[PDB]
């Protein structure tokens with residue numbers, strides 16, 4: 054309804070590009086903030102129609118555009134050329150804050166699905182701290198649901214609308230390019246994944262009860278969405294998930310079809326130089342990888358899925374606003 058401002062706990066003395074950007078663009082965070090609880094008020098939210106998501110998307114585009122400058126950027130006809138130094142890159146949490154005369158309403162219902170009326174509302178001045186993690190297929194390093202796993206979607210009947218699965222227990226994913234320079238791998242504990250997908254299958258079953266629930270790899274698209282793509286320490290990883298989204302939840306029970314080995318699923322990854330931009334329709338070319346080992350140790354806290362008797366779910370993503378929504382769903386700007 055208005056322009057918000059960001060608060061961060063950044064350094065003016067870290068090189069780290071999120072810190073640098075935040076110190077120019079954000080004010081410091083309040084040491085202990087004010088919350089007001091209003092259980093009686095009961096208010097409507099719609100996470101799919103949230104101006105905060107667009108404000109954040111604008112900001113993260115700015116951050117990346119100042120911070121991960123490509124050597125060449127191809128948009129439409131033009132090519133744009135510039136210094137592309139290797140940088141230290143590790144997302145930091147950002148708080149979105151209502152300016153004077155406005156507030157931010159938090160929905161406090163642990164099982165709120167992001168849409169409709171919420172009973173226990175709070176009013177606050179800033180959101181919690183959200184790390185702006187850009188990625189596809191798997192949401193990384195977010196905040197978990199307190200209770201159950203929530204299933205969010207603008208329209209679950211519309212199979213074109215992205216489904217956000219909000220997890221209540223994180224699943225570790227470790228991705229490394231060890232010390233072929235492009236080639237890397239990720240390890241996930243197959244038991245832990247096995248479980249998580251048991252219970253996602255349960256929740257999806259509640260919303261589609263006659264059908265049998267299948268997980269299958271991403272059918273088609275650019276590499277950025279047919280793989281789990283993400284930025285680790287400045288390098289763009291593209292990780293094959295066909296052993297991850299590969300299972301059936303039949304009748305109260307999940308089978309995992311992808312292989313594992315010693316009880317780990319290992320995804321093969323490539324580090325790539327030509328990137329299809331998430332900010333706009335265009336290509337970006339970056340310099341070859343830094344040497345050393347590049348390793349990111351991340352929590353999977355959510356999934357982005359797309360639905361095609363049986364219902365079949367594929368990993369999705371590509372619109373980073375869905376990543377922001379997964380964090381901003383319980384917030385609304387008012388007054």
Ligand SMILES: CNCc1ccc2c(c1)[C@@H](CC[C@H](O)CO)[C@H](CNC(=N)N)[C@H]2NC(=O)C(=O)Nc1ccc(Cl)c(F)c1
Pocket residue numbers: 187188189215275277278282283284289328329330331332333334335336370371372373
């Ligand atoms: C779900 N709706 C379908 C769908 C699907 C894929 C994509 C979109 C929409 C566009 C969304 C644009 C948005 O509206 C911007 O405002 C976006 C266009 N971009 C092009 N080059 N064609 C395109 N997504 C990407 O390319 C992308 O995610 N790449 C990428 C790179 C680096 C990293 Cl690390 C990364 F994790 C991801």
Ligand SMILES: *[C@@H]1O[C@H](CO)[C@@H](O)[C@H](O)[C@H]1NC(C)=O
Pocket residue numbers: 166167168169170204205206207209
């Ligand atoms: C979310 O909850 C609302 C009611 O609050 C309901 O109308 C809607 O269908 C639900 N959506 C999902 C995806 O569960």
Ligand SMILES: *[C@@H]1O[C@H](CO)[C@@H](O)[C@H](O)[C@H]1NC(C)=O
Pocket residue numbers: 199200201202203221222252253255256
């Ligand atoms: C998480 O939610 C699932 C599905 O909603 C539920 O079955 C499970 O008991 C919950 N687990 C934890 C650890 O909270």
Ligand SMILES: *[C@@H]1O[C@H](CO)[C@@H](O)[C@H](O)[C@H]1NC(C)=O
Pocket residue numbers: 208209210211212
């Ligand atoms: C969402 O689903 C379909 C679109 O396929 C349509 O009936 C309408 O847009 C929505 N329906 C419901 C029940 O919300």
Ligand SMILES: *[C@@H]1O[C@H](CO)[C@@H](O)[C@H](O)[C@H]1NC(C)=O
Pocket residue numbers: 243244245247248307308309313315316317
């Ligand atoms: C989950 O993974 C563990 C470890 O590999 C395995 O022993 C168990 O049977 C699996 N459960 C399934 C596939 O339902």
Ligand SMILES: *[C@@H]1O[C@H](CO)[C@@H](O)[C@H](O)[C@H]1NC(C)=O
Pocket residue numbers: 276279280293294295
């Ligand atoms: C992932 O790996 C499988 C088998 O290794 C292959 O069939 C599939 O095309 C790969 N997907 C991508 C996007 O590389």
Ligand SMILES: *[C@@H]1O[C@H](CO)[C@@H](O)[C@H](O)[C@H]1NC(C)=O
Pocket residue numbers: 269270295296299310311312
């Ligand atoms: C599941 O994995 C196996 C081997 O890991 C592969 O042969 C199969 O094609 C995968 N399933 C799908 C639907 O791709």
Ligand SMILES: *[C@@H]1O[C@H](CO)[C@@H](O)[C@H](O)[C@H]1NC(C)=O
Pocket residue numbers: 143144186193194283284285348349350351352
């Ligand atoms: C997730 O957080 C950990 C700890 O801050 C970090 O090491 C890791 O690189 C993060 N993952 C991504 C993809 O940013």
